[PDB]
Write a protein that binds this ligand. Structure first.
Ligand SMILES: C[C@H](CCC(=O)NCCC[N+](C)(C)C[C@H](O)CS(=O)(=O)O)[C@H]1CC[C@H]2[C@@H]3[C@H](O)C[C@@H]4C[C@H](O)CC[C@]4(C)[C@H]3C[C@H](O)[C@]12C
Ligand SMILES: C[C@H](CCC(=O)NCCC[N+](C)(C)C[C@H](O)CS(=O)(=O)O)[C@H]1CC[C@H]2[C@@H]3[C@H](O)C[C@@H]4C[C@H](O)CC[C@]4(C)[C@H]3C[C@H](O)[C@]12C
Ligand SMILES: C[C@H](CCC(=O)NCCC[N+](C)(C)C[C@H](O)CS(=O)(=O)O)[C@H]1CC[C@H]2[C@@H]3[C@H](O)C[C@@H]4C[C@H](O)CC[C@]4(C)[C@H]3C[C@H](O)[C@]12C
Ligand SMILES: C[C@H](CCC(=O)NCCC[N+](C)(C)C[C@H](O)CS(=O)(=O)O)[C@H]1CC[C@H]2[C@@H]3[C@H](O)C[C@@H]4C[C@H](O)CC[C@]4(C)[C@H]3C[C@H](O)[C@]12C
Ligand SMILES: C[C@H](CCC(=O)NCCC[N+](C)(C)C[C@H](O)CS(=O)(=O)O)[C@H]1CC[C@H]2[C@@H]3[C@H](O)C[C@@H]4C[C@H](O)CC[C@]4(C)[C@H]3C[C@H](O)[C@]12C
Ligand SMILES: Nc1ncnc2c1ncn2[C@@H]1O[C@H](CSCC[C@H](N)C(=O)O)[C@@H](O)[C@H]1O
Ligand code: SF4
Ligand SMILES: [Cl-]
Ligand SMILES: [Cl-]
Ligand SMILES: [Cl-]
Ligand SMILES: [S]
Length: 347
């Protein structure tokens, strides 16, 4: 259909595969700008002008898995590995809460050392501070997820990466889409606010695959959706592949907001890495969350999922203040509470 008719169907919520495919395939500037405006307006209406700050501590870059896209993959010998101590992680979290963070995100490689009991201990200590805790630790047994929920964790981020099971298995050779989905379903059953999401522009990924990602997210009605471009890392098998396209990734964020109007959607660091000011653009095209880096030196520079990451040369405490300034210059407001999903039940 024409751009105008696709927009009209999106506005009427005729979210057919055909409508989504055409939205992603049309490259017209006028169409794209209208799509972004629609997503921005839906964001404003459903989740308001508050931008929720989640302070992320990347506490270990040790990983047992070998994902082909990721700089932390176990086969990468050209990376200094680190582990923050439990005391360092708790005190770093406390500093974030002192700086006004209402959610602490603990993220790592799949590092066996902490699992499950050290994480449980850390979660309990951080929960005493009266903030939300979000974990992003990869795939672990149900029993671990259960222990972490009992310890007080509120949310879990586990991007589905790609909903194409063949592509998923090739890129993530230790595991599968079936396992990734079962993990996400387990997290939901246990009562976590659950986050999924995907990379855009993976080698071999098609527009139809992106449509499938959108339909998968809509199907499962995730609380959070993290989306960013694939960024090749020189010490991985995908070193020589093309980076994901910023505008296409932005369209995926916009469509995610249109499909899941009451969800929490970050403006990811990868978006700010491939285009200067990319996070700010993304916050104006459907996103309502930002995750300032709170990993301390000397470790911040060693958590290299992809190269060139912004935030690496700034001081340990710079990023929360940075995003507060950002929020103000965008004409937005910081989140007032923990920024949990506020469902708007509809038809
Ligand atoms: C109105 C003003 C004079 C000119 C000078 C530079 C122009 C911007 C830049 O070209 C970057 C970008 C290119 C895209 O294609 C369309 C949007 C952007 C933001 C432009 C908008 C507009 O056209 C600008 C602000
Ligand atoms: C600032 C910039 C140049 C404006 C200009 O000078 N012409 C006038 O007034 C008089 S005069 O022409 O300058 O003389 C305009 C031109 C196109 C605009 C973006 C698009 O809409 C898409 C999207 C819509 C969302 O809702 C909000 C974000 C997005 C990214 C927008 C941001 C911004 O708003 C843009 C970049
Ligand atoms: C940690 C440090 C020592 C004192 C302390 O431990 N305070 C703990 C404060 C705990 N909070 C963040 C939960 C207070 C809140 C109060 S209020 O709701 O904002 O009124 C205090 C002293 C001055 C404080 C900064 C400034 O104000 C400017 C700015 C205000 C923003 O809003 C948040 C960011 C900024 C950068 C602040 C961070 C932090 O806060 C600072 C560094
Ligand atoms: C200037 C920058 C390239 C910088 C560089 O690497 N050299 C390019 C790369 C991606 C471009 C934006 C996106 O397309 C989305 C959007 C489309 C609208 O139509 C106009 C506004 C937006 C925000 C664009 C502005 C501008 O055109 C950007 C920032
Ligand atoms: C201290 C730091 C420099 C400045 C830069 C931007 C400032 C914030 C924004 O103004 C919005 C708001 C008022 C309160 C808020 C959150 C401010 C806190 C503080 O004043 C900030 C962080
Ligand atoms: N090269 C790369 N380019 C863009 N994003 C990447 C990337 N490598 C990894 N990521 C993204 O970073 C996210 C965090 S990975 C860290 C958490 C955990 N090990 C897990 O795998 O879930 C991933 O879900 C993935 O989407
Ligand atoms: S994406 Fe997560 S599980 Fe895969 S190699 Fe990177 S850190 Fe390890
Ligand atoms: Cl979160
Ligand atoms: Cl994310
Ligand atoms: Cl990212
Ligand atoms: S930062």
């Amino acid at each position: 259909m024409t751009g105008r008719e696709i927009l009209e169907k999106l506005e009427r919520r005729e979210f057919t595969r055909e409508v989504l495919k055409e939205a992603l395939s049309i490259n017209d500037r006028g169409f794209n700008e209208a799509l972004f405006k629609l997503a921005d307006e839906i964001r404003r209406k459903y989740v308001g002008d508050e931008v929720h700050i989640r302070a992320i501590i990347e506490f270990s870059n040790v990983c047992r898995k070998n994902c082909l896209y990721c700089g932390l993959r176990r086969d990468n010998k050209n990376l200094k590995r680190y582990r923050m101590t439990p005391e360092e992680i708790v005190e770093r979290a406390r500093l974030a809460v002192q700086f006004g963070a209402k959610t602490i995100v603990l993220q790592s490689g799949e590092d066996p050392y902490x699992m499950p009991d050290v994480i449980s201990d850390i979660v309990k200590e951080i929960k005493k501070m009266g903030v939300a805790v979000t974990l992003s630790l990869g795939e672990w047994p149900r029993e671990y997820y259960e222990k972490w929920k009992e310890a007080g964790a509120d949310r879990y981020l586990l991007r589905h990466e790609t909903a194409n099971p063949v592509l998923h298995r090739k890129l993530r050779p230790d595991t599968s889409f079936e396992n990734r989905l079962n993990c996400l379903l387990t997290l939901k059953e246990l009562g976590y606010e659950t986050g999924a999401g995907s990379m855009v522009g993976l080698p071999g990924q098609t527009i139809d695959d992106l449509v499938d990602d959108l339909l998968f997210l809509k199907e499962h009605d995730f609380d959070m959706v993290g989306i960013g471009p694939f960024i090749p890392h020189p010490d991985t098998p995908l070193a020589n592949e093309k980076k994901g396209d910023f505008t296409l990734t932005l369209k995926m964020v916009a469509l995610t907001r249109i499909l899941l109007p009451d969800s929490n959607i970050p403006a990811t660091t990868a978006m700010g890495t491939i285009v200067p000011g990319g996070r700010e653009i993304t916050l104006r095209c459907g996103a309502n969350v930002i995750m300032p880096n709170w990993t301390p030196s000397p470790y911040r520079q060693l958590y290299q999922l992809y190269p060139g990451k912004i935030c690496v040369f700034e001081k340990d405490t710079a990023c929360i203040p940075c995003v507060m300034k950002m929020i103000e210059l965008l004409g937005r407001k910081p989140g007032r509470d923990w920024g949990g999903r506020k469902r708007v039940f509809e038809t």
